[PDB]
Amino acid sequence: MKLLLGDEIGQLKFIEIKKGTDTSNPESEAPVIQKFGELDREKGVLFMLKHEMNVFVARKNGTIECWNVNQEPPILSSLWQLDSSLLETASIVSMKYSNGWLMLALSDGNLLFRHIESSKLRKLQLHGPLSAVELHPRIPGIIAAGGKENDVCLYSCNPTCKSNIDELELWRTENVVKVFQGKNVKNDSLNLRVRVWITGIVFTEDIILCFHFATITHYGQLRFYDTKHGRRPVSTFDVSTSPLSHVGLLPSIKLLYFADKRAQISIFDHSKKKVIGRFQGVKGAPSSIHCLGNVVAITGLDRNVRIFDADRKPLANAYIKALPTSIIVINERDAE
């Protein structure tokens, strides 16, 4: 398993860990680690997009970089910068790739899109505080945004779906219109309005147009949606008491996972409407979880990297000294 990870001090570590590696056992061999990048806390890594083989890395100051991992160690293939005026009050909150477009959503709602080849940069304005924004995998030009006291909205750049749209005309300010807006659920038994604070968004139509996405909130609520059925969530589950950190999909078992800020990572079975197992042996909040094939990489505040499979069987484990901030799986298969 080849993986690489970024710390809060901005350093990048490429780990060549093999199955069975467990640092807590003296007899196990330590994983092969080579490190590169800046050593400043002001330039810490935030997000670690995987543009197939190429990898996009964010920084606390916005110094986006681009490393090709076909070469060992990866080299800085491209470097991009963001204006310092956009970092005075806001903060980078997500980064996703969609048909040759890189997204650098800000907390305040600024939506920065940069084309890969043409290097065209477009700014989009949105609603208030943003905490989670996602991009549709299949359908081009679909944006799902949500934040604290801000319901999920679907800003469809194109009215129809088709199968492909030319890249230049995408993401224009005058072409994006919201085609969906979440409606808050009814008040609870105590007649207290249910607070809304979206924290993660995932599109679950492949495992369940015709948008079928799932969100997770700051109040430990995992809400599934079906835009055809209605604006309110189709189903709601209180999967945790702690704020849910981030949500995603597991391609191997065709299922969904989520994590909260109390070191709890579990997989949710929409088919049975219940949580079916958990990723044991994790301490500290999981900073980022990446899945690729039949493997999952969890990195957290325990300064460890935990490698499980989609069946929640612990495959490998290692210590990385410094405090991490994101993970990414390059090679699912073993070292040999």
């Binding site: 710390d7 809060e8 001090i9 400043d40 500290g284 909040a285 505040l301 300064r303 000294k321 410094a322």
Partner: protein, 304 residues
């Protein structure tokens, strides 16, 4: 195996007596051949070291080597506690507070904690203010660390401290809390700033706690007062003691010089239960370290 109680007690007695006889005979013959040949006396003494929990401590790779590490020092020079350890040398300002509606027993211990720290305040907790609200309020009022002494049922059982404004927050459970009256051969503290000594914090999590305790004390002790505050971590139990020390002669000491300790108080112990990254919120705090009780049953496994 013998289901007759008396016989099994007589069978053990015969077994014990024979076991004691032949272990004495082995010891006696070994003693005779060691005094005759010292080359095996210290030969045995160099390998047959008695085992102890600390020597049989389970392996953890998070234990940092005594040699300096660049990566650790890179992470420690710009973190939350950096303003205390950098050239700025920001003087700590402590805020001490109890849980809501505490008793005189809580204050009789809070006063001792106040004695341990010069320039440390104490605002009685009143009304509907919360730990996440005091932290914001104390942040704008120039405070840099807020300690909340939790009691219920007339006993101070916990102590949560938050590093202001968003520094890591630690949750401790105090135990064996003794006041200066309860200590035999105590003393009366003076106004001199104490000197802090910290021992046995090998793990990297230990340094996060050690820096948190270091940041409480003024960085320049008044040596002329010879007051020393000790924070010692043994088997994850953190012991807090305060002493008065005076150097004098000591024949048993290696260099002939040794110090006499007179305890000042307060005397107590802590266990680190929770570490959060940010202001202490019990329900929504980002857990840096949670103490799993079932994993602490291994007496050889420590996280501090």
């Amino acid at each position: 195996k013998i289901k007759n109680k008396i016989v099994r007690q007589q069978q053990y007695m015969k077994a014990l007596h024979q076991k004691n006889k032949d272990k004495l005979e082995r010891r006696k013959e070994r003693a005779k051949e060691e005094e005759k040949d010292p080359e095996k006396k210290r030969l045995r003494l160099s390998e047959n070291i008695p085992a102890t929990i600390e020597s049989k401590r389970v392996y953890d790779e998070t234990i940092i080597e005594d040699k300096p590490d660049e990566e650790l020092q890179a992470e420690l020079k710009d973190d939350e506690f950096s303003a205390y350890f950098s050239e700025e040398r920001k003087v700590p300002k402590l805020l001490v507070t109890t849980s809501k509606r505490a008793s005189r027993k809580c204050y009789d211990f809070a006063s001792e904690l106040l004695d341990c720290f010069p320039n440390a305040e104490f605002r009685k907790r009143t009304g509907d203010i919360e730990v996440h609200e005091i932290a914001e309020a104390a942040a704008k009022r120039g405070y840099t660390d807020l300690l909340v002494l939790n009691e219920d049922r007339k006993k101070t059982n916990a102590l949560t401290l938050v590093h202001l404004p968003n520094g890591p927050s630690f949750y401790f459970t105090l135990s064996n809390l003794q006041t200066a009256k309860e200590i035999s051969n105590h003393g009366r503290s003076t106004g001199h700033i104490p000197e802090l000594i910290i021992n046995n914090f090998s793990t990297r999590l230990g340094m996060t706690v050690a820096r948190a305790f270091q940041s409480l004390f003024i960085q320049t002790p008044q040596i002329q007062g010879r007051q020393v505050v000790t924070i010692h971590c043994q088997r994850d139990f953190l012991f807090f003691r305060r002493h008065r020390y005076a150097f004098r002669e000591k024949s048993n000491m290696p260099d002939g010089i040794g110090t006499g300790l007179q305890e000042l108080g307060p005397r107590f112990t802590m266990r680190l239960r929770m570490v959060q990254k940010g202001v202490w919120d019990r329900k929504e705090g980002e857990v840096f370290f949670e103490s799993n009780a079932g994993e602490e049953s291994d007496r050889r496994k420590f996280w501090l």
